[PDB]
Amino acid sequence: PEAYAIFDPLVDVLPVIPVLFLALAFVWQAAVGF
Amino acid sequence: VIAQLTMIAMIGIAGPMIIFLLAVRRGNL
Amino acid sequence: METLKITVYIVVTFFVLLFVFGFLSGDPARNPKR
Amino acid sequence: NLWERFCNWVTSTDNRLYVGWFGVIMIPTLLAATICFVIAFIAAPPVDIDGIREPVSGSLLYGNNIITGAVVPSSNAIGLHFYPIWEAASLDEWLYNGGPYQLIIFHFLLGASCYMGRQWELSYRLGMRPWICVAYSAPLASAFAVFLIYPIGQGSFSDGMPLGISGTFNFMIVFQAEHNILMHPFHQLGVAGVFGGALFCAMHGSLVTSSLIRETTETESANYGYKFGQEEETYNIVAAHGYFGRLIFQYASFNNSRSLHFFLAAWPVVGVWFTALGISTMAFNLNGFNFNHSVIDAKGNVINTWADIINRANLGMEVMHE
Amino acid sequence: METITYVFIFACIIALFFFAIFFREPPRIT
Amino acid sequence: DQESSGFAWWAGNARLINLSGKLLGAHVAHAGLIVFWAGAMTLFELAHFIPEKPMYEQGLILIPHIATLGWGVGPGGEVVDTFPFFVVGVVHLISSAVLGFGGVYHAIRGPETLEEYSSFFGYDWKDKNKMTTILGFHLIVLGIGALLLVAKAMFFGGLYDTWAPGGGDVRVITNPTLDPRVIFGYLLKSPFGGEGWIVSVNNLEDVVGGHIWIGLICIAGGIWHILTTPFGWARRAFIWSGEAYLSYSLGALSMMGFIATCFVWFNNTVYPSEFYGPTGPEASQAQAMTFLIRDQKLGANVGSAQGPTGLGKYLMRSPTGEIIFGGETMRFWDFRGPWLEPLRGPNGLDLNKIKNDIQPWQERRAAEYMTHAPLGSLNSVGGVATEINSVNFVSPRSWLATSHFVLAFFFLVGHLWHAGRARAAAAGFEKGIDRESEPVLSMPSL
Amino acid sequence: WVIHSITIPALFIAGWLFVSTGLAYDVFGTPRPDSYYAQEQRSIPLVTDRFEAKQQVETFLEQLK
Amino acid sequence: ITPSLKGFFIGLLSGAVVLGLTFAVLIAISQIDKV
Amino acid sequence: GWFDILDDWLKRDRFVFVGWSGILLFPCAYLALGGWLTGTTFVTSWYTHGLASSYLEGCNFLTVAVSTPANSMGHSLLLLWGPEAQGDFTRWCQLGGLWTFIALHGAFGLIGFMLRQFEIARLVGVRPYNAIAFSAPIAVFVSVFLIYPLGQSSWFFAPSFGVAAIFRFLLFFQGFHNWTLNPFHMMGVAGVLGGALLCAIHGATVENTLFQDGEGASTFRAFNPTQAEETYSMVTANRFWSQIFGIAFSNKRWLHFFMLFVPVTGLWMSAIGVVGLALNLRSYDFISQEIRAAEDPEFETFYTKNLLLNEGIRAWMAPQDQPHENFVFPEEVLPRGNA
Amino acid sequence: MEVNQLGLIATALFVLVPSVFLIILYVQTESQQ
Amino acid sequence: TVRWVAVHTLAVPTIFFLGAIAAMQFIQ
Ligand code: CLA
Ligand code: CLA
Ligand SMILES: C=Cc1c(C)c2cc3nc(c4c5[nH]c(cc6nc(cc1[nH]2)C(C)=C6CC)c(C)c5C(=O)[C@@H]4C(=O)OC)[C@@H](CCC(=O)OC/C=C(\C)CCC[C@H](C)CCC[C@H](C)CCCC(C)C)[C@@H]3C
Ligand SMILES: CCCCCCCCCCCCCCCC(=O)O[C@H](COC(=O)CCCCCCCCCCCC)CO[C@@H]1O[C@@H](CO)[C@H](O)[C@H](O)[C@@H]1O
Ligand code: HEM
Ligand SMILES: CC1=C(/C=C/C(C)=C/C=C/C(C)=C/C=C/C=C(C)/C=C/C=C(C)/C=C/C2=C(C)CCCC2(C)C)C(C)(C)CCC1
Ligand SMILES: CC1=C(/C=C/C(C)=C/C=C/C(C)=C/C=C/C=C(C)/C=C/C=C(C)/C=C/C2=C(C)CCCC2(C)C)C(C)(C)CCC1
Ligand SMILES: CC1=C(/C=C/C(C)=C/C=C/C(C)=C/C=C/C=C(C)/C=C/C=C(C)/C=C/C2=C(C)CCCC2(C)C)C(C)(C)CCC1
Ligand SMILES: CCCCCCCCCCCCO[C@@H]1O[C@H](CO)[C@@H](O[C@H]2O[C@H](CO)[C@@H](O)[C@H](O)[C@H]2O)[C@H](O)[C@H]1O
Ligand SMILES: [Ca+2]
Ligand SMILES: [Fe+2]
Secondary structure, X not given: OOXXXXXXXXXXXXXXXXXXHHHHHHHHHHHXXX | OXXXXXXXXXXXXXXXXXXXXXHHHOOOO | OHHHHHXXXXXXXXXXXXXXXXXXXOOOOOOOOO | OHHHHHHHHHHOOOOOOOOOHHHHHHHHHHHHHHHXXXXXXXXXXXXXXXXXXXXXXXXXXXXXXOOOOEEOXXXXXXXXXXXXXXXXXXXXXXXXOOHHHHHHHHHHHHHHHHHHHHHHHHHOOOOOOOOHHHHOHHHHHHHXXXXXXXXXXXXXXXXXXXXXXXXXXXXXXXXXXXXXXXXXXXXXXXXXXXXXXXXXXXXHHHHHHHOOOOOOOOOOOOOOOOOXXXXXXXOOHHHHHHHHHHHOOHHHOOOOHHHHHHHHHHHHHHHHHHHHHHHHHHHOOXXXXXXXXXXXXXXXXXXXXXXXXXXXXXXXXXXXXX | OHHHHHHHHHHHHHHHHXXXXXXXXXXXXX | OOOOOOOOOOOHHHHHOOOHHHHHHHHHHHHHHHHHHHHHXXXXXXXXOOOOOOOHXXXXXXXXXXXXXXXXXXHHHOOOOOHHHHXXXXXXHHHHHHHHHHHHHHHOOOOOOHHHHOOOOOOOOOXXXXXXXXXXXXXXXXXXXXXXXXXXHHHOOOOEOOOOOOOOOEOOOOOOOOOOOOOHHHHOOOOOOOOOOOOOOXXXXXXXXXXXXXXXXXXXXXXXXXXXXXXXHHHHOOOOOHHHHHHHHHHHHHHHHHHHHHHHHOOOOOOOHHHHOOOHHHHHHHHHHHHHHHHHHOXXXXXXXXXXXXXXXXXXXXXXXXXXXXXXXXXXXOOOOOOHHHHEOOOOEOHHHHHHHOOHHHHHHHHHHHHOOOOOEOXXXXXXXXXXXXXXXXXXXXXXXXXXXXXXXXXXHHHHHHHHHHHHHHHOXXXXXXXXXXXXXXOOOO | OOHHHOHHHHHXXXXXXXXXXXXXXXXXXXXXXXOOOOOOOOOOOOOOOOOOHHHHHHHHHHHOO | OXXXXXXXXXXXXXXXXXXXXXXXXXXXHHHHOOO | OHXXXXXXXXXXXXXXXOOHHHHHHHHHHHHHHHHHHHHHHOOOOOOOOOOOOOOOOOOOOOOOOOOOOOOOOOOOOOOOOOOOOOOOOHHHHHOOHHHHHHHHHHHHHHHHHHHHHHHHHHHHOOOOHHHHXXXXXXXXXXXXXXXXXXXXXXXXXXXXOOHHHHHHHHHHHHHHHOOOOOHHHHHHHHHHHHHHHHHHHHHHHHHHOOOOOOOOOOOOOOOOOOOOOOOOOHHHHHHHHHHHOOOOOOOHHHHHHHHHHHHHHHHHHHHHHHHHHHOOOOXXXXXXXXXXXXXXXXXXXXXXXXXXXXXXXXXHHHHHHOOOOOOOOOOOOOOOOOO | OOXXXXXXXXXXXXXXXXXXXXXXXXXXXXXXX | OHHHHHHHHHHHHHHHHXXXXXXXHOOO
């Protein structure tokens, strides 16, 4: 929609960030350190 | 692109940031 | 031909019927420990 | 009671061959598959793939070495329809259209599944951690993929694997023609999965044979010294550890057998799953990426990278098939 | 001639299976 | 926690088995993702979306679903106003913002165990009552939505139509078909060739009338379970325990997948070939007719003929009274699509009628399905399988069936995985065989 | 932590240039993106026989358009 | 001394030397770290 | 202790272990890899096969590799100076001499690995079933990349050391040499699979039998590698398999030795066939069925259908694959189906 | 159908002689006291 | 010493090829 016309990167990548959660888990393990 | 690329880089870097702030806080994990 | 049809049904029905009750009767009860 | 006693006999472990409740399906179906197989393999009327022209004799009685002999799959005329005996008009009609194929693979598959469980329901009754049935899924994945699934993508069992040593070779090559499976990534992992299986199978086989606490004389066989039920460790880890630990850097040697053997069984399995996924990805006509005209000059001429050669060879085959 | 050798060869396989499954010397413990 | 009470990290989630307070935190958060993913793709697709061209051309796996409920579609599959498509996705996002927020709340500051804060919400896995109580509510709620579909079907707007007397698009069902004759007996059909199991569903109004039952069956289910308690034969089997519940869920969820794999790949009724792209069987089917008409158009009569293969150039007479297309297409004589069936006569195609009865849309559309016959590559190199670098696509209809299958395959393994660990756990030796007394050690030795 | 802010940048830029400079072309003799078919004459400049190729590669390369 | 022979000579000459030079390095190095 | 002091230095303990073989290995090995990458990125194959697959053209990762010097370039070893290169570097890469640079430096490197896989032993005390097991890739490597080319008109016929390169080498056999049906190659597919299979079935069984030395559910850390009795009961596993598949292994020794055996024997009996196929002795038409096929066209077997396939591959692939032959086939002549 | 005339002896000797050679060794072992 | 000689003589050219990789992708 034109009222929304520009948020380029946000609408470009929403869907990748769900994957990032899986990645976050490891980093959240990294500091905790297994 | 690059403007958009910059926007994407800026838009979701809370992951690492979140952990770093939390790590500094020594909150809970 | 046609006799064979009903025959296969009866035979197949039998095993599968014999089959389920094995689990429907006390299957976990059969094991080294409990 | 008869039942309560009978039920106790099926489950019973004293049998020389354990038949669990899955065995109640497994045994009759496979025993029915083999009987209707070996016969059909030996004497098959010249099953016809296309009612138009060409009967194919894959039977053993007609001039076929084991190599060339195979059970022809069902025709295209029959399509994918469930085609049992009685539904077919005449017995010879049921053979001429490739019945025995559609008969074997059903009893085989439905036999293969129940087998996958029969390994389980024994393991549960010997009091042991039951993951074998996971490991066995890898072939069974491939079975369903090439036999049951892939023809659904083609809507006819004709394109299913003709089961036989030449039939299989015919299958791949033709399969290579259409879907370009080599360039597909999932297969390209499956190779790694198989080799690294065979590879590790050599090393983990070698390193432990290399290190043997010696209970044997030089003249006597080296094996016989192992006494079934030794509670000694038959092979030094400390000796073999540093070996591979010196051969390459000491960091990667996998100190822990329980850590090793799992990784020993993860690599081949996971390698195979991707293939049975790689096929199902093909059956739906989602193919291996074939990079073509990846190179071009400024003059529009085709620099013709290697993949085109393959792209041509496949393009060669498909015309041949029809 | 041709075929009848294969069935023969393939037969002895089966005659080995049934024979090798049941008649193996049990490897007793200890 | 750490591994000390627990097990290792790579598996570390199952540390949650006994903590319900953390457990809700998981799901609600996880459900948050699924929701968030849903709206994301919606907007993601909506930004790159072209309303003029067809949907399957766009490589579009979601908007067709929203459209299929008849919002913004228009007749002709026009895809009239995108704003309803926009509203759907964004709402799910906002909904996720709440979910994960809660998911976090139970993850941390929420009580670590629910056996105290609320006894009602409290449950023990081994309890066969208070758990079954829960199974009711969902089975009620999950049954509500099924009806809430029909609320779209019978009342609000109207759902998509595969077959309309023309245009095949939008209809508000009046009388849904319901009775055990064609419903319970419906699934009784063979799975195999020529009769789909659930994949036939010729009429739209089947599913609506059907969901009515599944609507009113599940509402009974809750009322049944809420007011009941497992019987003896239930208690003797099923291994009531934390894992097994997950294990059963998989098996059901797995078999669902293969079914979902089957619909998208075959059924034209629910997923209209129009904006989901043509079904594989229809693809070669329609292509076979476009060749037919183009040659029949000009100075040639293909009706009574032979081919170089011998079966005829186009039409054959099946063993059934109906006459079909030749070529490879003959393997699909069962297909009936919205465009083809009217062209068909009482037995097979009426050749005299085929020439005359063609429409402006049919022939065009039937030819539009010629270009797209489900195919393609992972980098999307399209056209006919070995056709060289032309018409590059992979029809979305092929993606779902591929995707959900692979996933559905794993869940079979998953089911077969936990079911092992579930029972062995209950059996107590899941921890490994016991070195003190080996169960095999003392047995009759064969 | 000391010269590893020096070595890497100065070195990595070298590889950047040999492509940009195209120095890698005449070093490894790869064809240049416009250079395959001199004139038109679309055919493979396939080197043939021995004790020649050093001179024969010259011919194919000699034309270059 | 034709092209081939001369050319071949160049190969082995520098070839052997290169191979032989490695030995010196190893030989020297070992002498350096005498335990 | 001139020679002496040198010895102990090589045999000392460091990060890695450089043995006497190490002198041979690392230089010979590091060049092979070190060569392959370079030739992959930069050196074209153009003047050789007339078709550029290399990384600096548009080509991807999978479709790049180092091709081979052409047919009429013959079996010459293409040294860096050489008669042909005459000490000129550029034309020594364009001719694909870099290929041979890889093989030879590879082989000796490949050898040098083997020797290392000995020299470890005598100073450790293990028995050398490792090196001996490693002779299978040797035979495979030597047979494929060395004996096979020499049985042809030139080096031109050989794998090109690449992901896609090896594929145009695969179909290359199926069309011409009819490789799948070669029985020596069926023993191979036994070995590999038979290796992979038993690889997975061993790793699964021992993973399903564990004495439970630790507490937590996950048993990895549960293992203590100190003078322990066998970490998994052979007793269970034996009686286990004996009741399902019917036949088990009662010897940890006889088992593992059987793992070492099958993959190895799998390759050698394949490495024989390839040698047999270097001479173009390829397993091919069974005189029985062929003659029978001359007694009627209607008789058809899944064998006969392969011959058409192997016929099509040849004709279509020939002009591109072998430009040096200067084949031009007319259109109709291609053995198209529907005819 | 037509065949190598002598090919049959091949199998027989290739079957029996290796087979027999395994039996003879085995029956011996059975006789070991 | 010994270790340093390994990576230095190995990973250094890697950094030098990464130039060729990247600086190529911007050609054409
Ligand atoms: C319905 C979903 C579901 C749920 C809720 C659970 C729940 C559980 N499973 Mg489980 N499982 C399921 C399905 C499910 N399972 C299925 C379908 C399988 C078969 C694949 C398994 C196989 C399985 C095993 C083998 C194990 C569990 C375990 C567990 C427990 C801990 C979770 C865990 O190990 O996370 C672990 C999380 C990770 C290891 C991180 C994920 C890393 C993987 C590799 C991601 C790769 C996927 C990705 C798409 C591929 C790469 C991306 C690509 C682009 C390259 C927990 C009770 C563990 C257990 O012992 O249970 C008690 C355990 O060992 N599960
Ligand atoms: C993606 C699904 C998922 C979910 C919902 C969870 C959830 C959970 N895991 Mg977990 N896990 C997962 C995947 C998941 N896991 C995978 C894939 C692995 C394998 C890699 C693991 C491995 C693992 C281990 C090994 C353990 C857990 C544990 C836990 C629990 C406590 C974690 C904790 O202390 O958080 C604390 C979190 C933080 C201190 C910071 C996290 C970062 C924040 C939450 C980011 C916020 C998200 C987003 C940006 C904001 C949304 C809200 C917004 C609207 C305002 C928690 C319920 C632990 C457990 O047993 O439970 C007690 C535990 O020991 N997990
Ligand atoms: C995919 C095939 C394959 C690969 C890649 C492979 C690789 C390896 N196996 C090794 C070992 C083994 N392999 C064994 C059995 C087997 N290995 C097999 C198959 C393989 N084995 C098979 C099928 C078997 C029988 C089942 C054994 C028994 C061993 C070992 O003992 C040993 C080990 O312990 O593993 C660590 C290692 C020795 C490497 C070495 O000395 O490098 C140094 C050699 C060099 C650098 C020479 C160069 C290599 C060749 C000549 C040139 C390569 C060309 C380019 C570099 C790249 C080509 C590009 C390709 C895409 C074609 C290495 C990790
Ligand atoms: C025409 C197609 C033919 C198809 C062939 C299919 C089977 C081939 C499997 C591969 C060979 C056997 C592998 C084990 C070798 C071994 O070593 O098993 C030995 C006896 O095995 C054998 O003599 C195997 C003889 C045939 C096996 C029959 C399998 C029956 C399957 C029934 C399926 C039911 C659903 C006994 O084991 C060893 O025997 C002694 C060796 O020193 C010691 O006891 C060792 O510790 C160990 O116990
Ligand atoms: C011209 C290039 C380089 C020079 C001159 C250089 C310099 C040095 C020197 C003199 C040392 C030993 C003294 C010390 O450790 O402080 C060293 C150590 C090290 N440097 Fe570099 N460096 C270079 C490139 C690199 C690169 C590309 C890497 C990539 C990882 C690297 C990583 C290291 C490492 C790992 C060590 C430890 C050596 C060991 O542990 O034996 N350096 N560097
Ligand atoms: C922004 C935004 C938002 C938000 C979102 C978020 C917040 C997200 C998150 C994110 C995430 C969640 C992220 C994460 C991160 C991650 C990363 C960054 C990753 C990387 C990687 C890593 C680091 C890994 C690691 C590793 C390695 C590397 C190797 C080894 C292994 C391991 C694994 C360890 C919203 C919605 C509002 C919308 C608007 C915008
Ligand atoms: C028709 C239709 C419909 C509806 C739906 C329905 C009506 C369905 C139903 C379905 C169902 C409702 C199904 C069922 C099935 C069955 C099953 C699958 C279940 C599960 C369970 C079981 C199987 C059990 C198990 C077991 C056994 C077997 C043995 C013993 C043990 C146990 C018990 C565990 C619709 C609308 C959609 C559409 C149209 C058509
Ligand atoms: C030829 C020659 C030579 C050689 C050279 C050399 C020595 C080279 C170098 C070598 C080397 C040593 C190099 C290296 C390089 C490397 C590379 C270039 C790599 C890369 C990598 C990559 C690209 C990876 C990727 C990835 C993956 C796979 C996954 C994850 C992610 C990532 C991205 C990481 C010489 C001079 C001697 C002599 C003359 C001639
Ligand atoms: C569990 C095991 C069960 C195994 C079941 C099968 C066992 C039966 C074995 C009987 C074999 C009879 O073997 C039979 O040999 C003859 C001649 O030798 C073959 O006959 C072959 O030569 C004759 C002429 O001599 C030709 O006319 C014929 O067309 C050709 O096939 C038969 O095709 C084969 O069937
Ligand atoms: Ca974009
Ligand atoms: Fe082993």
